Design a protein around this ligand. Sequence first.
Ligand SMILES: Nc1ncnc2c1ncn2[C@@H]1O[C@H](COP(=O)(O)OP(=O)(O)OP(=O)(O)O)[C@@H](O)[C@H]1O
Ligand SMILES: Nc1ncnc2c1ncn2[C@@H]1O[C@H](COP(=O)(O)OP(=O)(O)OP(=O)(O)O)[C@@H](O)[C@H]1O
Ligand SMILES: N[C@@H](CCCCNC(=O)OCc1ccc(C2(C(F)(F)F)N=N2)cc1)C(=O)O
Ligand SMILES: N[C@@H](CCCCNC(=O)OCc1ccc(C2(C(F)(F)F)N=N2)cc1)C(=O)O
Ligand SMILES: [K+]
Ligand SMILES: [K+]
Ligand SMILES: [K+]
Ligand SMILES: [K+]
Ligand SMILES: [Mg+2]
Ligand SMILES: [Mg+2]
Ligand SMILES: [Mg+2]
Ligand SMILES: [Mg+2]
Ligand SMILES: [Mg+2]
Ligand SMILES: [Mg+2]
Lengths: 267, 267
Amino acid sequence: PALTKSQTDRLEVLLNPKDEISLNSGKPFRELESELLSRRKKDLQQIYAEERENYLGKLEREITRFFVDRGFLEIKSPILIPLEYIERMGIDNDTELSKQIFRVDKNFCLRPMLAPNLANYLRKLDRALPDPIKIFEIGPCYRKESDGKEHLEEFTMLNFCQMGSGCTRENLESIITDFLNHLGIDFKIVGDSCMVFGDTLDVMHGDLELSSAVVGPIPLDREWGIDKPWIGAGFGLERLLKVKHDFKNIKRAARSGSYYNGISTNL
Amino acid sequence: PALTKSQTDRLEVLLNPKDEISLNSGKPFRELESELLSRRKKDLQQIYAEERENYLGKLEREITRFFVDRGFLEIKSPILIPLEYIERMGIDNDTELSKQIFRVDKNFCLRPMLAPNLANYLRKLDRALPDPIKIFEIGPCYRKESDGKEHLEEFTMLNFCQMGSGCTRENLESIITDFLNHLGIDFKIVGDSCMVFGDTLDVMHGDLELSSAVVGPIPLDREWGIDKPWIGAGFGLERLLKVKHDFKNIKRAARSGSYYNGISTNL
Ligand SMILES: Nc1ncnc2c1ncn2[C@@H]1O[C@H](COP(=O)(O)OP(=O)(O)OP(=O)(O)O)[C@@H](O)[C@H]1O
Ligand SMILES: Nc1ncnc2c1ncn2[C@@H]1O[C@H](COP(=O)(O)OP(=O)(O)OP(=O)(O)O)[C@@H](O)[C@H]1O
Ligand SMILES: N[C@@H](CCCCNC(=O)OCc1ccc(C2(C(F)(F)F)N=N2)cc1)C(=O)O
Ligand SMILES: N[C@@H](CCCCNC(=O)OCc1ccc(C2(C(F)(F)F)N=N2)cc1)C(=O)O
Ligand SMILES: [K+]
Ligand SMILES: [K+]
Ligand SMILES: [K+]
Ligand SMILES: [K+]
Ligand SMILES: [Mg+2]
Ligand SMILES: [Mg+2]
Ligand SMILES: [Mg+2]
Ligand SMILES: [Mg+2]
Ligand SMILES: [Mg+2]
Ligand SMILES: [Mg+2]
C-alpha cells in the first residue's frame, strides 16, 4: 500500500540523517513509525543520561570560548531595540528587508541583526580601550521570512568585529578560516552585495550562505560615529548546526518545542 | 560649590560599589569626574586584557553547568511566543501583569516568563524519558515595568523544574539551597502568593526577591496537560548579579549599551 502525504510527513519528522530507511519500500506505515519512534526515544534517552546540553547553547559556549581566547570582548546587548535603528542602518522603509522587521509597540522592534548595537559598542569602547577594539556577540535575531529550508524567523547570530589596526581583508579572511577550521566546516568565499553594507564576502558551504562579512570603511559609518577602519562578519548558528549534523531542514536546529537536538519531541 | 542634580547623576553613573568617595565633600565636579573616569577606564582595560567574559553570559554558563551536572536537561525554547499562552496561563486579560506584556504583531508576544514553554517540554518529554523529568532554561524574558531599582523590562530568567518522583517541598528547598550556596548568596524562604501559580515559596535576600518557587500540582496543570507532581522555581539573573556585585541599581547588570560588567561605557 502507498503512504499518504500526512504519513510521509510524520515519518520525515521522526527520521534522522544517520538513518537509512526507505519510506516507500512497501513496509506498512505502522511498522516504519514504530521503528523510528523506538530509535528516537533511544536517542533522547541517551542524551538525557549522558550529555544534557542543548546544541544551540553548547555551540554558543564553544564559539564564545574561541573568540574570548583570541582577544575579543564578549557583548550581550538588547534584543528589543529602537525602531529608529532600522532606518538609520539604510534599510529603506519600503525595502523587502524592511518588511521583514517584527515591530514591538510603536517605537521598538526585535533586532534583525547584531550590527547596530555592536557599532555603538565599538564607538564607545574606542574612547577607553587600546587599539584594536575586538568584540563579538551571540544571540537571538528576528526576521519575517518566507517558508524555507534555510530560514527561521527566530534565529541566533554571531557577529564578531574589529576596529582600528589590523582591519584588512586578509585578516578578516584569516579569522573566518581559523573559526570554521575550529568547527570543522569547509567553505569558500564568494563576492556578493547587500543593501546595508554594500559588497560582502559571503562564506559559502556549497550553496548555503553561512556568513556575510564586510571590510570597512563604508558610507554608513558616519551615521554611527564610526571613524576608523573596521572588519566584521555575521554567522547564523542554526545554519552551522545544519551543516554539522546534516539536517535537511534548519527547523531541526532552531529554538523549538518540536525538536530537541534534532530529535522530534512528538514521541 | 554645590553639585547640580545633573552633575551628581553623572558621578553616580561613574561610581562603583568598591569606591569610597564623597561626592559632596566640596571637591569640584571636574576633579571628581576626572578621578572616576580614570578608575573606570582602568577597570575596563583590565577586563579587556584579562577576562573578557560578560557577566550575564558567564553567569548563564555557570548556572548551566550546575544544572546539567545535577541531571537537568538544558532547554532553549522560543522567546517570541503565541499570545494565546498568556490567557491560558491564568493571566486574566485585565490583570496588571497582563498589562505588562509586550505584544508582537496581532497573535504573538515576547515571553514574560519561561514556565509555559517548560510545561510543554515536561509533557512531551514524559512520553520518552524515565522518571523523573528534570529540565531547565535560561534566557531573555520581557515585562513592561514601572521604573525601579530592581526591575528591568528586558531581563534574564532561569527556571528549573522537575516532574514525577521527588517533587516535594523539601527537595525543592534543597535544590534552591544547593544552588544559592554554589553562588555564595545568603537567603531565606518566605511565603507569598501570585495570580498564576497561587502560593509561592519566595527566595529572599533581605527585601530583594530572588525567586518564586512552586510545589504542584495546581489547578492550571490540566490546561497544560500536566498530570503528575512537579516542582519549579524561577530566578532573575540580573538580580543575582546585583547581589553578587553590590550594585545600587539593577541596570548595571542588564543587557545594555550603557554598562559593561557594571562599568559605564560613557567614558
Ligand atoms: N532568517 C534567517 N534564519 C537563519 N539564519 C539567518 C537568517 N537570516 C540570516 N541568517 C544568518 O545570518 C547571517 C548574516 O545575515 P545576513 O543579513 O547576511 O543574511 P542574508 O544575506 O539575508 O541571508 P539569506 O540571503 O540566506 O537570506 C547569514 O549569512 C545567515 O547565516
Ligand atoms: N522586571 C523584572 N526584572 C528583573 N527580574 C525580574 C523581573 N520580573 C521578575 N524577575 C525575576 O524573575 C523571578 C520570577 O518571576 P516572578 O514572576 O516571580 O517575579 P515577580 O514576583 O513579579 O517579581 P517582583 O514581585 O519583584 O515584580 C523573580 O523572583 C525575579 O528574580
Ligand atoms: N548581518 C550583517 C553581517 C555583517 C556585519 C558587519 N558589521 C559588524 O560586524 O559590526 C561592526 C559594525 C561596524 C559599523 C556598522 C555600521 C552600522 F551601524 F550602520 F551598521 N556602519 N556603521 C555596523 C557594524 C549583514 O546583513 O551583512
Ligand atoms: N515565573 C514564575 C516562576 C515559577 C515557575 C514554576 N513553573 C515551572 O517551574 O515550570 C514548570 C511548570 C509546570 C506547570 C506549568 C503550568 C503552566 F503551563 F500553566 F504554566 N501549570 N501548568 C508551568 C510550569 C512565577 O511567575 O512565579
Ligand atoms: K540518511
Ligand atoms: K574549514
Ligand atoms: K561604596
Ligand atoms: K547561601
Ligand atoms: Mg535574507
Ligand atoms: Mg544573502
Ligand atoms: Mg548575507
Ligand atoms: Mg513583578
Ligand atoms: Mg513578587
Ligand atoms: Mg515572584
